[PDB]
UniProtKB/Swiss-Prot annotation:
Organism expressing this protein natively: Methanocaldococcus jannaschii (strain ATCC 43067 / DSM 2661 / JAL-1 / JCM 10045 / NBRC 100440) (Methanococcus jannaschii)
The entry's keywords: Cell membrane, Membrane, Transmembrane, Transmembrane helix
Main location class: membrane
Keyword Transmembrane: yes
Name of the protein described by the UniProt record: Uncharacterized membrane protein MJ0091
Length: 299
């Protein structure tokens, strides 16, 4: 309608700007309550809350007999998370990785390499069932090594604020992203600038807006571990969660080009984390590869 396609667009961005910040502050206070590293709270609670858009999209698309979008959206998100999301964040707040997280990232690499190998055929529902189970135990393994056993425990009005601040921030970024996207074709439709590729590859970016905005918030507060966790977790939540659910309704066609790309960056992310840093010149490299990715890779 334009306006409601604008007074939306802006309304969503404000719910993204402040929403991401509250979702970060809420998670970081929760992470300190469960005594758990920022990496883990980002790899679990945040990663899944942010990857809810891809899950529902991939599910809805695969069910609607459009499996190409489902897998395309799942892998497209992963590439965006390493290239754009982590790329921007690394420059802002460089992270050096302790040897506790290097192995968690190494697990991520094996996981991705595994999905790529069994994905050459495509993704049968069985292929998805396995991924969904590997995804489940990754979380528990991540919580286990990242946690310590203490008390636990409340009415504690310092935890209720943490919990509430978290879910408000989550509802904020999910709605704020939804408003942004809905507000984005209302502006496009009423100027008659619409077809196929804007109607999709805009929402392909729409599901990635929660990760982007949330990571920018944590990076600006130098909570780099949380960012790194939210990137790794979301990716696994995209492969083991979004993609897997897509395989249940229908066979997902092979995307060996995008997988090979994802593996390379994932490989790059590990090597940087083990022997070097994740700072300006690595983040720059990720963005460059992301630029090349969106410039050259097909429809
Ligand atoms: C080298 C890095 C290897 C990384 C994975 C480790 C062993 C590969 C096991 C592959 C088992 C499946 C082989 C056939 C295949 O590629 O298709 C899978 C099928 O669709 C569904 O199992
Ligand atoms: C390792 C464990 C499985 C070993 C052989 C599976 C052979 C399956 C043969 C029948 C299905 C088609 C096939 O050979 O698929 C191979 C796949 O394409 C390759 O990536
Ligand atoms: C967690 C809960 C998950 C529940 C759903 C799990 C599978 C969905 C149903 C899949 C039905 C597939 C029917 C056709 C079939 O048997 O396909 C065989 C396959 O191709 C051999 O590789
Ligand atoms: C409930 C909050 C803690 C959940 C931990 C899940 C992974 C470990 C399960 C066994 C220890 C509890
Ligand atoms: C080029 C695609 C349209 C860009 C319009 C301005 C930026 C909108 C976000
Ligand atoms: Cl940190
Ligand atoms: Sr997401
Ligand atoms: Sr397969």
């Amino acid at each position: 309608m334009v306006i409601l396609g604008v007074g939306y667009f802006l309304l969503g961005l404000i719910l993204l700007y402040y929403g991401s910040d509250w979702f970060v502050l809420g998670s970081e206070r929760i992470a300190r309550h469960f005594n758990v590293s920022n990496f883990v709270i980002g790899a679990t609670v945040m990663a899944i809350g942010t990857s809810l858009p891809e899950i529902l999209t991939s599910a809805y698309a695969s069910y609607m007999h459009a499996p190409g979008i489902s897998i395309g959206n799942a892998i497209g998100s992963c590439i965006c998370n390493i290239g754009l999301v982590l790329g921007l964040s690394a420059i802002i707040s460089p992270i050096i990785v302790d040897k506790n997280l290097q192995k968690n990232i190494l697990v991520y690499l094996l996981f991705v390499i595994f999905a790529a190998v069994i994905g050459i055929d495509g993704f049968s529902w069985i292929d998805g069932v396995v991924l969904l189970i590997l995804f489940i135990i990754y979380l528990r393994w991540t919580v286990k090594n990242g946690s310590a056993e203490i008390e636990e425990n409340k009415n504690n009005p310092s935890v209720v604020f943490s919990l509430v601040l978290l879910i408000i921030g989550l509802i904020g970024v999910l709605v704020g992203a939804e408003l942004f996207v809905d507000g984005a074709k209302k502006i496009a439709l009423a100027l008659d600038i619409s077809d196929k590729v804007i109607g999709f590859t805009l929402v392909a970016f729409g599901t990635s807006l929660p990760e982007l905005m949330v990571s920018l918030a944590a990076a600006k507060r130098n909570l780099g571990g949380m960012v790194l966790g939210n990137v790794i977790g979301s990716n696994i939540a995209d492969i083991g969660g979004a993609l897997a659910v897509g395989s249940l309704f229908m066979h997902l066609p092979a995307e060996n080009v995008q997988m090979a790309v994802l593996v390379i960056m994932s490989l790059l992310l590990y090597l940087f984390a083990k022997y070097s840093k994740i700072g300006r010149w690595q983040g720059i490299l990720f963005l460059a590869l992301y630029i090349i990715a969106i410039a050259s890779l097909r429809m």
